[PDB]
Amino acid sequence: GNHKAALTKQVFTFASELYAYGVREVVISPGSRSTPLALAFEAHPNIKTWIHPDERSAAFFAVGLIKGSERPVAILCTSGTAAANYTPAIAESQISRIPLIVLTSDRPHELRSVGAPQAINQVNMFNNYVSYEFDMPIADDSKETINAIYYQMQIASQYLYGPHKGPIHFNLPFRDPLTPDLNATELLTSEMKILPHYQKSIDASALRHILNKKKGLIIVGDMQHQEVDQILTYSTIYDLPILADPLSHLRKFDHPNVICTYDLLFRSGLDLNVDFVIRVGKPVISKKLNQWLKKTDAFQILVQNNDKIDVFPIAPDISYEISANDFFRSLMEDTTINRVSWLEKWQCLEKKGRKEIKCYLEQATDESAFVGELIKKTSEKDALFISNSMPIRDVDNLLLNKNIDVYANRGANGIDGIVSTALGMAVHKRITLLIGDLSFYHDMNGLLMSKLNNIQMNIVLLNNDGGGIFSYLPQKESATDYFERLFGTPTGLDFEYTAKLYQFDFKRFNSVSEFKNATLLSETSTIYELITNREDNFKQHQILYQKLSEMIHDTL
Amino acid sequence: GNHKAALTKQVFTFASELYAYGVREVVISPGSRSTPLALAFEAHPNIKTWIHPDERSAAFFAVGLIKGSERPVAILCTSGTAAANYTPAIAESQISRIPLIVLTSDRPHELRSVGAPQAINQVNMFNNYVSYEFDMPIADDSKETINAIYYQMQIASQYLYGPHKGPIHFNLPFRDPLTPDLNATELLTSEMKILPHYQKSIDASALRHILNKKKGLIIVGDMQHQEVDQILTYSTIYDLPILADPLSHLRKFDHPNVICTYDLLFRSGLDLNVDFVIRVGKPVISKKLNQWLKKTDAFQILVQNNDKIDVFPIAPDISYEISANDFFRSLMEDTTINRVSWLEKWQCLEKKGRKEIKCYLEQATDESAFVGELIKKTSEKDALFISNSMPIRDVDNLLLNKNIDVYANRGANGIDGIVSTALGMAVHKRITLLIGDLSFYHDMNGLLMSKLNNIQMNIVLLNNDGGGIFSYLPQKESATDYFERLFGTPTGLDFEYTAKLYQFDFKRFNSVSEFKNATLLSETSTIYELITNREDNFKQHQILYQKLSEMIHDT
Amino acid sequence: GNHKAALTKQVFTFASELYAYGVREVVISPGSRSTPLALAFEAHPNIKTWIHPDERSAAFFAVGLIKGSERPVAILCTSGTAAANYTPAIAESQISRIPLIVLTSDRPHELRSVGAPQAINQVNMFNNYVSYEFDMPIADDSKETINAIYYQMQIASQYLYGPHKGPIHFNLPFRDPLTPDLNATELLTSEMKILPHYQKSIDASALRHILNKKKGLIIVGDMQHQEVDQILTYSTIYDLPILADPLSHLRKFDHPNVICTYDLLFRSGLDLNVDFVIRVGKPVISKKLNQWLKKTDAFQILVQNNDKIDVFPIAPDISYEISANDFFRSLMEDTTINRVSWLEKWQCLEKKGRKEIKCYLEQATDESAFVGELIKKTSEKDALFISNSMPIRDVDNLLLNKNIDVYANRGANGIDGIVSTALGMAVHKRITLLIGDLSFYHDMNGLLMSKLNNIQMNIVLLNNDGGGIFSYLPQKESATDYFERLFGTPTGLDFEYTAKLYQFDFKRFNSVSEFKNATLLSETSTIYELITNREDNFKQHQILYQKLSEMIHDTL
Ligand SMILES: Cc1ncc(C[n+]2csc(CCOP(=O)(O)OP(=O)(O)O)c2C)c(N)n1
Ligand SMILES: Cc1ncc(C[n+]2csc(CCOP(=O)(O)OP(=O)(O)O)c2C)c(N)n1
Ligand SMILES: Cc1ncc(C[n+]2csc(CCOP(=O)(O)OP(=O)(O)O)c2C)c(N)n1
Ligand SMILES: [Ca+2]
Ligand SMILES: [Ca+2]
Ligand SMILES: [Ca+2]
Ligand SMILES: [Cl-]
Ligand code: NA
Ligand code: NA
Ligand code: NA
């Protein structure tokens, strides 16, 4: 069997070469044309498989496995609309730099024709998002077509780790008959390639005249899956305040120089002249702080550990493509700069601000109170996955010194795929998901992975019956007559039926009090639905956004 | 063994199928990777080859071969930047709807990699301009890789004829070794395909209220390689004036209803009220007429025999995708109205305007005087290829009732590849090329085909040492300190040396008096360089542009 | 009016910010729609313009200015097929990593429509080649239209200098009226931005198990515009032979470990067993050495100082993105071993090989002898620009220890734009061009830059009236009847007329004896045409390709 041999050799060598570069699990979607490679993944004894019927949720689930395992994961689907369902997670992968390996199976080269049944053009179909894309040769007996696997995987490997990391696309034409020879297990190897690892440094001589000024600020944004330890060391030696995003992983250390309440301080009118700012990582969540960067005259230095850097919210004076740890290690040099006065001011504001939050949280009965209680209930060394919209903004204002991790899909900021991404992380981590009802409806299909494979994850569902974030927009007042139809968008759905469909336990609370004396338990994966009111949430959030306004004028 | 026989079969079949759908000649550029299909065309007894070392001029030479033969023509190049040089003529073919078949050879799929030596991405590299692009499978002995030719040639044929006409692209990977079995001549077939022929008609009931209004106008723009006879029939029966562009192929008939001086008329301040206009073809050359279309309140009907209709310069009231003949034929079987005084008003403007042009052409000493003489010197039933920039504007104003044809690359309006396109038509037609010096410089490499292949074609070279069209720009006054350097851009080239290099005879005229008593009949192809001055040309053109202002006010 | 001020503020700020990021030259092509930006470049007192009517040659001319100045250069053209003529130089810039800045002028959105007169789609029209593309907004009075220039310029700057270097695209729509206010000279500023610099390092310990083996080779390909000195330092300490390409810039040092005759050695039948190879830079010219790399089972390391690494001709076992100097200074932490015998075998072969080459050049009378004599004549510390096809193969075989630099277009290996690229380099460096007749005809229009602006550059034209390189192909014997028509392609042109047209001096040599006893350097730029015969060249080259056979007796 000349064809069966070549197809088996190609498909089994490809799966092993994916293993050789770090792939340990794949998410497969059912289909006919994907048969040869699907069987290779299942037969390979060191590649775990996950079968997912929904291609959209499957790709977001794989994004979750990548964020949880810190390894590249591959997805495999058949030809046609299946591949088109990958685009949302591929788009989030592009911005968030997720090493997602997209494999689309195709008809053989001689049979392809755009416009035929189930025949879209798949070659370079993700060109808008990926940095690597290749159309595999058809399998034959020659040595050159096998070496293409080694040749192309070596090129592709530069996009799976380091700063060039991002989604890649292999298009794989397969000729009938499709089923390979399952006896050739000798071609299912488990070798391990040596991966290149670098270390960077910069000469900061021309920068010491800035860094030696007194009123300096370190601003750390999204830093999931990066190391941040040397940021704390530089801050301790040089007395520099750190404004730390929730996704910076820096608030859990309880560092005496970490400022967590900056979004409330700036919202309430904090206005200080600062000499320089060191923006590290992806942008922060705080709308008000990002707007302050577009107004300050401070010297701006941006530090980001990826290629294709974007300088949101404003072009800095210099942009460094380097890891935060390597950057701050180049900056350590004995100097006699006293800025204790500058640091003691920020340490003092943060003290009073942390106190005012605790006073608001004692009298709060709104959605923000529910979020504060979940923060209190989360065990140390555990993790929260926070959905987009308001949950991630409440975490910013409310997470202070708890030793926990928070994760999010803060790349494209979509409300899609949150369930699937959280579940993928729960495969490897102890995580609890916090989500609004619109995102929960968006990726309801994602719960199938919990039902079929018993992935342990509780879900804290905030149900204010629509889009709450829009209450804080000007259209609530300038388009009152159309607000609830265009922006409210209530579903009115009974999510207790969702729990029974996907075999979650269900509990509903109508006040923070019942939530306070309850206990989240890992006996089974359960959905806790907390009922809030969007109008009530807006009123109470307004109270919170101006709580610090008195201390600012008082400290002045 | 099998490889040579599989490669021969695929490549000889592909060449034979191209013949079956209309291809009779190809323009090959040298290279190694293009070996198998290059030898196929040369071996095929009914496919003529042209070998051109400059891929840019080669693609424009193919465009000319298409325009002169009215049959699709293929170009073949090797992998790499050879394919990238095709892009200018591919972009011109997208707008002008030229059925140019673009064949790029590639390395085999298993060896492909963007960034390797001589390795750009050729798959869908012309996606920005073509309506059909295919990456062929590597040659096999199986029937399905051979049937892919029959399958994709049938799909690609819809872009070679009719309204979907335009450029198409095949990327052909070839595996080493690349030489085919030249003795397998049985696979070099010469079948001829039967092809669909349609006729269209529209329901004109909801257009009769417009068409029965008196003050109507038929505006015919670019109609190259299209049939226009029923336009004259409808105009005769219904007393409608025809504002005929030079490229409409209508001015040569000396029809009593064809107005040739509309551009000067509208330049001189014509401001008649019009009930409706029927715009047929691609946009006209006249900037002033296209501005008037953005101002008139007339009912606008657009008629174009091609898909992807663009509606320059303004969206009409209705757009019909139909040939001109099939459009006017569907309106002919109707009753008639009396609009004779409207037709005669226009006929009187044309008679006096033509009399004023004859007067101007006796005094003038500028570039437009040279152009008018060439029209007079052109033998009847012969053709002219007009460059872009000023020459196409001067033909618009000066070509009246002469029985000649005029062609031009009026899609992208590029100054590139003019020489090669003109020579391409010259293989099939009696053609004289009129061209400015900068465009002559641009495609000087295109002259190689005249030397190597003995293409009889004379060249009238209008040399004013720079870009004369920019004299009529507001920058000539508003940016005078920088004008000559930025817009003038003289070369100072002695084009007699170009004539010697490419084995052209040469003659240089400094005045229109010498050119008038000269003769363009030549034993060998020859280059006539006519020396003019850009400022002198600007000043005399402004008199020409305003000449009809007094006669217009006397109507 | 208001439009004239907003337009002026846009183009004057755009041109200044280009200067701020390093642009000093711009090559403008005439057109109407380009008027605003064209006058801005002319009016700017510290940007020099070149005016070129042929966009194809113009873009290759800019490539040469980038190579000569080692700065980014911008090109500007009007709408339509003018931009399409840029494609070949952009393709070469993609592979060779040339920071070519492509500026295409476009109609405003109200007149943007594919199919309209002179209206091709220009936005992302270079998606196939460039690393950055942007469609500028139409100028208006808002500050954000200006701020987009500062924002986008910082992003685009990362593609102009480092390992991410490559062609970038700006499409700029301009609305009538087009003339800017030339009295607003205050907006044409000459600030200079600070640009980041890094130093990388790898952990040599991961390669330890390989680099302690004795039969190791360093193979250095195209390294032009790169630092190369630490390769010599590393090879000296560790006794490693260096096979050096002409474009490696390493042959001009007479380093005891540099091998320049490897190609002839392989052609002459050299067989060798290698423990490891370290491939540095872009691929080597030698077909034999690249074919050998596909057959050896040595451990292979690839090191390139650019992103988007391709691994031609075979997949290495590991590949590093790092400069050669940073890589080898990292390998300098290892202790040495004993491979002195291995080095001696290579040093002895190179000694006899150089004597055999010198012997050949005394006897040869073909195209080869002309090239060998041109190298001898060239002044030291001057430079050659070598065309593709045979001249670059002959320089590989004949260039030994002459103290000169060699440059070429070795990305896409096209025969287009060679003349213009050398001329661009001659503006910043002392260079003589060596080019075959078919490539000379291909870029004949590029000589306009020499007539108009009086660039000093001699041209050595190897005229054999056809494609000489195809003599060495299997087609010469397999399809001999069609060879002259399809591969020879004689033009029969008398290039004395080309010299008169572009105001060059002309001298024609029919014998190597005439050429050896002549003087080339002169006050005026000269075209030296050396008539040779393709058939005799093939035969004499056969003797050269076997001139080193009597030195090879045993496998290395
Ligand atoms: C895929 C996608 N569609 C739409 C949006 C726009 N969007 C942002 S927030 C939001 C509503 C989120 O509602 P919910 O999850 O209930 O949270 P809440 O606003 O109540 O906190 C929408 C539709 C988006 N970000 N992503
Ligand atoms: C490829 C290309 N580049 C630029 C232009 C812009 N352009 C239009 S007309 C013109 C000048 C051409 O001058 P020439 O052919 O000498 O004729 P003249 O204006 O003197 O009549 C130019 C550069 C173009 N049309 N095509
Ligand atoms: C743009 C382009 N077209 C075609 C080729 C294919 N090609 C490579 S070398 C060559 C011949 C070059 O001839 P010439 O400059 O006279 O050099 P010779 O072979 O005689 O040394 C050709 C056509 C190419 N590399 N690039
Ligand atoms: Ca909600
Ligand atoms: Ca001119
Ligand atoms: Ca030659
Ligand atoms: Cl030497
Ligand atoms: Na498995
Ligand atoms: Na033939
Ligand atoms: Na200037």
Numbering used by the authors:
A (entry chain C), C (entry chain B): 2 to 557
B (entry chain A): 2 to 556
Please, what does the article write about this entry?
MenD is a thiamine diphosphate (ThDP)-dependent enzyme that catalyses the conversion of oxoglutarate and isochorismate to 2-succinyl-5-enolpyruvyl-6-hydroxy-3-cyclohexene-1-carboxylic acid (SEPHCHC). Catalysis occurs through two covalent ThDP intermediates as the substrates oxoglutarate and isochorismate are successively added to ThDP before SEPHCHC is released. Sau is an important human pathogen, and uses MK (predominantly MK-8) for both aerobic and anaerobic respiration. In this work, we report that the Sau-MenD is allosterically inhibited by DHNA.
